[PDB]
Write a protein that binds this ligand. Structure first.
Ligand code: CL
Ligand code: CL
Ligand code: MG
Ligand code: MG
Ligand code: MG
Ligand code: MG
Lengths: 465, 465, 465, 465
């Protein structure tokens, strides 16, 4: 059931309706690669939901109340006040993905100096690390381990909180590695495993108990803190009558600091946060704020403009609107349910995205011929929809052999920019897939005509086989 | 078929989802009168589409480029340039409903001085006068006549252009009254007859031929000039492949000047226009521009702020977007069709609004007990929808007898703010009526508890019988 | 002493610097009439300060938080709340000059029905009526009388409150006319007499005492309520340590309602207010709100857009900023003092404007040759400054004889848009006059080449003699 | 001579006027450190001109026309089009300081692979490297050399282009180091040497000739490209009648690519650019665009919001406005001249900033007691001005000895945010220094009460001695 919008549309960005012939020529010009298509030629852009969503009236208005002072800005104060009242965290560092490149080395050095952490043995844990989070950890020489539950990636097996930490696994992992060697634990909410799955407050409390016992810093990766709070309100009986705000205040008692991209639930096109709960982490705050300036090995300055901090200060609240969250989540579920109904199969589908199995949809196309990229092109031809391939095309070649890397599955990712498209667009997408599935046998595979040495998915050009 | 939005939502105004109990208390506090309800307590506000619609990104941005100079403003120039390029009219007077209070007395005096028009015999014609247009005409001592076609108000009899002028009637009326006594003819597009019906270009050309033959000024009442152009493109074969812009340029060759509220098709919350095609009406321009200043009997100044003129300068173009018009019109038709399907009957329904027959829907309620007002309250209770009664409640009492005035039908008006609500909201409205029709027998009539002497519909309070 | 700006400039409107040759050609193209010059060709536009000033960040931001609902708008509520907290008035009617055309007929009818007011004998009083206020009064058949003090127009005789009511005169006038025949008294603050002069709170209390004794409605014409409050704080010892807000709350206890153009002290480009203090004037509120709809003799709708009401709701407060008022007033006084220093003489100069005596500055030019218009053109040629003539040119011809009307003095008006120009611009203006005074003897008189029958000053074209 | 503003102020940010007692308490609360003062408590904030200036109406409006698409954004296209038409560069990479961290390693590797550049011998040249530019170069293991002219830092010796490259020195340096070992040459305009000094087009052409001869990449560090163009128009006879735009197009023929922070001349609060002229540097473009994504050692995404790119697309043009540049530069020169007149001495003063010698102004205060920080506090106490110390306080302690580092001079930096303050503020600053110089002997030195281990200037607290 797609819920009606708990809002009145106030500002729109016109998008032209193209003809089939126009799109056919467009996709050829772009070398059968949606990444090379002009935004204006895309009717429904499902490339990413990162900073591509709508803002509320108050959020937009906030952009015109900025204090551009380098220091002591009232706009910075407003943002810090929002964090304090919403998460209960006293220290705020605005960022322009939550400054993972900052807190990671800071936490590693902290434990090395205080508990004799061994850099050659250190391991960080999370219910599920985001790619960049794992990236910065490993770059800093830290091994990572995802301690997710058995039900996490098990489709066809409904579970209210598939993003939960595997409490036993975490405990066993810490003991195995040695508490002095665990620089931090990252609690990702909602979790990025299986398309996006929530984490229960009960699970978070249990995880924090474990972390506290071993005195291990806990960082809440909060890009989708609001949707997680909504899932808790909807599925965790204990919090059924709690407001999203109360659930959020409670949730954050179970972390020592937070790091988040504001480009998701916070509703803004740019910005992030790195915050610390209380004085116990004041030194961590200082170190991070310091490293923020000299991260390059010398002083470098810059930051969000005043208006952007004022906008986020408002966005943090609007992002928690109960009616909004119920609507956003219901729309995503509406799309998935609609696709499942017409026979479209997804390897995984959650709050973050739906990963359609193009291999199953287009079985006649060899993996090396990129069936998911072929599907992306067909979806554009038929409906002007742009989606990203998550398969052999994206995977690329082995840097040491120059040969195509082996890929588990050929998926096509569908993300939904917040408060941007309607139920009618969702039905349009479903009808598009229905048409593709019907004409599947006739979709051709692809082969390169131009291929970069690295990050080929962004600018490579292909032709039909 | 509800078309998908030819745009991405960019800015939203949050609206809270209320409980049935909350609305029940709300409607009682407002004395069973939606006019007294707080806007925040209304989920779907169908009160009016006048200046309540969304704006495009470019239109909003324009508000920040204003030149506030009293005279010679580049913002005024930009607006005049838009009028010249869109309608082909060389003279523009921005207004803050198209200054009917200005051109009417000006045109009357013009013909009185030039052709000996007799004020005691003068009569003005239109395919259908808007209420305020008829109001200003009559206040100026001018009688009005609507020369609409037979098919105009005939439901159950599809006709492509029900707003057409009755060419024979117009001709006969002019001859009857005497050409020297006809100060002007107003071509309303789209026409306000039967809920809003289009006027064909063929019909407009024919009407202008008649007017020109008798040298009678023709004023194009243009609040919905774009939707009319769209209907011409959709239904008048000759213009099937013409752009909305070309149809508009052609359409305006068949009027000498134009008057319009910009609060409809032009997409803005305020403003209007009074324009003249060429030098042949330069003296009419001068007189109007002059009367604009001394309309009160002495000089009075003021006008749209610069940003507002820049916004309208853009709005005139965005309002003609083909995809937008097709979408707007399809949504309105979608609502009407959906209501017809569930057994809801409308006395008239067109592009402007749908007039539900509350008397037929709630036959047990006596007219004097306001069945349409009762229906308005029930619609709010059940779905938080606000609609206006067009019946005995609005009609009021006879100023000379203090008795209720007799009313032809008890109607409930449904209007749709542009680019504000979605197909999901439309379905919500339809489901609401479905529920009401199902529980019709139990809806009670109303009686006053407080009643003003004039304009009672705005602040009167009632209770159930 | 020009005070430094109590603010940081945040948004600017570029204005091109023209050459002398360019302006020489420009003024000729405009027929030696600044009113016909393009705004872009004017470097410093002193035409009017009405709605031509800057806005604060919060005021601008407010424009994006509008609730466009026809009724029950939260934006209307916000504006009404501002009025209640600032003036203490419970009833608010937003207008789009304070709806003088509304309260005047309403107050006249009120006293006619309640106290037997005789329309053939009625007379309204004010410390000084604004032109439009006097206009609407007289149009309604009501005679007006300005009861200003002796020192009001006496230059060379400093007096702290030259805008004061002549308390004795008011008393004597009421008795003479008969209290039943005085429909209302208008307290104009600041007063428009002698270029703008303040009214003391002591004087207002005394006037209200008189009005209350006779039960005569008192309307506060409040376009410049804030500057008056500032003058009271600066010159009335009793209120030296009172805030502008406290002075305003106190001031408004001495009126029954208020009417104001928001285009002055309220800092906005459009809008006004008509408000009533308490229930004692609830019927006056109802009548006005009612007449607002049917003022034309039938229902007509429209109003400020939501954003505009939100903006004014903020503007009413920002307009009272103490540092801002001190700065605005000091700048005006700085210009006048600077002109006086170089030998330029003004017939009158106050907070509203400075009226330079062009006749004295250019004694060789006959009045019929418009020395003030000649001066306006010269000021533009030399510095790109645009100012309005208040003399024989503006006065026009006698409608009954077609002959030039006799004029007391040939003045050139200088107004200063709020927060728009700097001390450097003020010095630029002073230097311009210094240059003109130096080359006075060579400035030529003007004669028509094109002259409209009415309101000739706006579009007439002239040439040098 | 302070020029009048070539613009009308449209939006202001109110700033409160504080009392001496208030500021005295404020500076004590902030531990005698302006960096710890609330922005609201600072009347005139001269901390930095980086992203603290005003924007034009069109620039602000642009923020509401953003296309947030991840790729193919029309907003990105608009920005790239501006770069192409203004600089003639075909390739644009928007950045969120011009991505020095990107082009430096890219250019180093390019020459290492193509000409056998030796990383242990590489040296980069510039007329004067900005601190961060030198920082990234050295971090990449590249030694830097500033080849400025003899007259560069020689005060009391006027020279039109003190930012010029020492052509002979550059030639000799390249030969000495070996052309294969010079990865790039950076042309900084205007140059950051001696407070900001321009570079002539003749000098740039000569430098490019040298670079081209040796096939060495030339990067134009363009934060202040417009002011440099203005100085060329004002001082280089050959370009006297050329427009700023023509001078800019010509100037950029003498570089292969450009890198710039848009937070200066480009008038925006955030953003930068890294651009390449033509196909000869297409591979450099690709490499940079690629490294932009994987700079962290793995893919990371993000970028300027659509509105920000639209704003910069406009800002690049508005920043070149001739009247604006003349005004901006004249104001800076007005401040310096005014200070020189009252006996205040600056070690260096140019277009970027003025460096007051606090040691000379307060000779009784020992360097270790921070006379420039003492001066900063006194300036705040007396006038509410905030300025940054560039002396022993900023220099800090030797990381290897913990002892105060030796400092050449105790300077206080004065920067001027663009289009933010007026001539009256400039006079206010001058009067403030006049007062300080008069009460110099009584100003006390400072000593720590709290001192961080690193970057102490930002949060250290001190007390008077
Ligand atoms: Cl706001
Ligand atoms: Cl714009
Ligand atoms: Mg900034
Ligand atoms: Mg205006
Ligand atoms: Mg409205
Ligand atoms: Mg983005």
């Amino acid at each position: 059931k797609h819920l009606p919008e708990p809002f009145r549309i106030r500002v729109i960005e016109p998008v032209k309706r193209t003809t089939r012939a126009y799109r056919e020529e467009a996709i050829i010009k772009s070398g059968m690669n949606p990444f090379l298509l002009d935004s204006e030629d895309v009717f429904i852009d499902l490339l990413t939901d990162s900073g591509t969503g709508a803002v509320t009236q108050s959020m937009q208005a906030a952009m015109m109340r900025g204090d551009e002072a380098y220091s002591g800005s009232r706009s910075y104060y407003a943002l810090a006040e929002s964090v304090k009242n919403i998460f209960g965290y006293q220290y705020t560092i605005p960022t322009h993905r939550g400054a993972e490149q900052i807190y990671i080395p800071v936490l590693i050095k902290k434990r090395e100096q205080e508990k004799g952490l061994d850099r050659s043995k250190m391991v960080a844990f999370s219910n599920y690390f985001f790619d960049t989070t794992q990236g910065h950890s490993q770059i800093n020489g830290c091994t990572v381990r995802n301690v997710y539950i058995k039900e996490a990636f098990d489709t066809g097996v409904r579970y209210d909180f598939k993003g939960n930490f595997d409490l036993e696994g975490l405990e066993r992992g810490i003991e195995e590695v040695g508490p002095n060697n665990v620089p931090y634990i990252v609690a990702t909410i909602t979790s990025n495993s299986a398309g996006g799955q929530p984490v229960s407050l009960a699970n978070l409390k249990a995880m924090y108990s474990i972390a506290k016992k071993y005195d291990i810093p806990v960082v809440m990766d909060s890009a989708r803190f609001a949707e997680n709070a909504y899932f808790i309100k909807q599925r965790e009986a204990e919090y059924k009558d709690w407001t999203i705000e109360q659930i959020t205040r409670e949730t954050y008692k179970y972390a020592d600091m937070l790091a988040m991209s504001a480009k998701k639930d916070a509703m803004v096109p740019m910005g992030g946060l790195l915050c610390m709960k209380d004085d116990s982490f004041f030194d961590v705050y200082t170190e991070c704020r310091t490293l923020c300036v000299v991260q390059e090995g010398f002083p470098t300055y810059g930051g969000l403009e005043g208006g952007a901090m004022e906008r986020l200060a408002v966005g943090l609240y609007d992002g928690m609107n109960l009616d909004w969250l119920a609507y956003r989540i219901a729309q995503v579920q509406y799309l998935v349910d609609g696709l499942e109904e017409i026979g479209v199969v997804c390897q995984q589908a959650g709050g973050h995205a739906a990963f359609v199995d193009a291999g199953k949809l287009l079985p006649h196309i060899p993996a090396d011929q990129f069936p998911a990229q072929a599907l992306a092109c067909e979806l554009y031809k038929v409906a002007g929809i742009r989606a990203v391939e998550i398969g052999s095309f994206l995977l690329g070649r082995d840097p040491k052999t120059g040969k195509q890397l082996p890929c588990p599955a050929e998926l096509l990712r569908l993300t939904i920019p917040r408060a941007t498209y309607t139920q009618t667009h969702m039905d349009f997408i479903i009808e598009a897939f229905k048409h593709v599935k019907e004409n599947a046998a006739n979709i051709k595979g692809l082969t390169f005509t131009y291929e970069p040495k690295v990050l080929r998915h962004f600018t490579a050009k292909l032709k039909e086989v």
